[PDB]
Amino acid sequence: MRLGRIASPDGVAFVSIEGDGPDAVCKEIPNFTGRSWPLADVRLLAPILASKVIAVGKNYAAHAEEMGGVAPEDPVIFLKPNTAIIGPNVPIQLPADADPVHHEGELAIVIGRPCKDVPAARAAEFILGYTIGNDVSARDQQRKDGQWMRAKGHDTFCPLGPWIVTDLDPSDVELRTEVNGQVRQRSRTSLLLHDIGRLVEWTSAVMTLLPGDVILTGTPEGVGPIEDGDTVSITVEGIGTLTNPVVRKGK
Amino acid sequence: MRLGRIASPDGVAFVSIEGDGPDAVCKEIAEHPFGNPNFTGRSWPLADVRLLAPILASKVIAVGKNYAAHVAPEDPVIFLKPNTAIIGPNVPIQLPADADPVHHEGELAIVIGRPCKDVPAARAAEFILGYTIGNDVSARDQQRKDGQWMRAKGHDTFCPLGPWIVTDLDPSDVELRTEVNGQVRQRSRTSLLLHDIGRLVEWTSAVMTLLPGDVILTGTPEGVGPIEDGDTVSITVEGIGTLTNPVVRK
Ligand code: NA
Ligand code: NA
User: Is A149–B78 a contact, with Cβ atoms under 8 angstroms apart?
Assistant: First the structure.
């Protein structure tokens, strides 16, 4: 199943998306009501209203073989404000002064139940599903501030979507980022330094996680700049593709 | 005017708090504390209810270094605390078993009153509901280790807020004081802020949209220090009152 939010002519609905052909249907909601919008008629929004967004930075091994092996250091987690969230096909707006601003394609965990102190092995019990995220980052501000929050916290700097997949096996799916059709990031989640359960364990040991909260699981190598007029597309195997145009704000 | 949130026999309510003696009264404000307040006509004695965190912030922004001793300051460094860290007056700060030391950091807190973005420092007060007190509780060992300060300052209960929001306060030059078990740890005045309230609202709203209820912690003076199981921490701001929390180690 794929869960998400859509903008209809009747308004906003939380829907179930079913079908891979453009004869695709969004059915409203789980108890279904009966109203059906084709996917063609409506527009996908960010699939959930997150109270907070937690992200990790360094979380991909370079290659499977190294290592392995020796335990990775503990995760470093941080927050992006939920005001940064935008959905598919919404422009990423670059600050006039921010150079360079980087794309960071990531697999996103969506929490489905309130939780605290969850053991890594039980993480799936509290996970609604998986979607795609982009941890857009003003790299200059990162270096100036030390704290990464401002750099990653601007409005539109957290694209999320296109929908939430509830039955995905996210253990070994391909993640890739394209800029204007050009592949710039490519890895598999089998190379996650801290896997999904470890991240949920680490994060819920720190703070209460609420239904809707998002945990971005990190980005592999290849992070690179995005400029006015670019299109960034992040594809996760078994989920789909999150696409956003890019515009720079005037001075 | 003092605006708070209370737990009453009738549920949770926003209130105007009136009086300082034993017969203080809480006057119910309809739905939220933001516009011109609408009084329902319902009220409770303060003695009959319990003050909660005065606002349900969608987010909490904070700054690190922001008081002069008594050099030109570097630009503000802001970060986030999750709103799941917020607790109200008298609620125990719960220390993680493995965190040492954990420090108190008494601060003046801005509460945003209107949605906004790209606010000029000069006009910040037009967008500010009022001022309350905060404690930016920080696990120092985690802070140093992580580089990023979020985890160190993001544990459940690591953001005491309260006891209420004062709407007609001139915060230009008020005393800020932190006591632990009756001993003064921190004491300074807001006239020593490196980045004043205006500069912080300007800086933060240039980055992100702020919502009514959002909180900006304006930093802490010298004298930060450890808290431990059994301690009581009290932060006082002249013109607001005192935010007090006991401390327990898990
Ligand atoms: Na004001
Ligand atoms: Na602080």
Answer: yes
Looking at the fold, whether A42 and A61 belong to one and the same domain comes out as: no
What's the CA dihedral at B129, B184, B173, B37 to 10 degrees? 20
Give the ligand at the shortest distance from the Cα of B63: 2
Nearest CA in chain B to A141: B77
Q: Are A153 and B207 in contact (CB under 8 A)?
A: yes
B156 touches chain A (CB under 8 A): yes
| A66, A39 contact by CB (below 8 A) | no
Specify the experimental method.
X-ray
Are B47 and B68 in a shared domain?
no
Q: What angle do CA A48, A191, A118 make, to 5 degrees?
A: 50
CATH number for the domain harbouring residue B2 = 2.30.30.370
- Which backbone phi and psi does B63 adopt, to 5 degrees? -115, 155
Q: 90-129 in B: which are within 8 Å (CB) of A?
A: 117
What's the B216 CA to ligand 2 centre distance in angstroms?
10
User: Given in angstroms, what resolution was this structure solved at?
Assistant: 1.8
Rounded to the nearest angstrom, the minimum Cα separation between B124 and chain A is 19
Which helix (H) or strand (E) segment holds residue B247: the answer is: strand B241-249
User: Which domain range does residue B209 map to?
Assistant: 55-250
B211 interfacial to chain A (CB closer than 8 Å) = yes
**Do A41 and A86 share a domain, yes or no?**
no
Which neighbouring-strand residues pair with B94? Answer: B248
The residue with tokens 């105007």 is B16
Q: Are residues B44 and B163 in the same domain?
A: no
Indicate whether A34 and A81 sit together in one domain: no
Q: How many domains, chain B?
A: 2
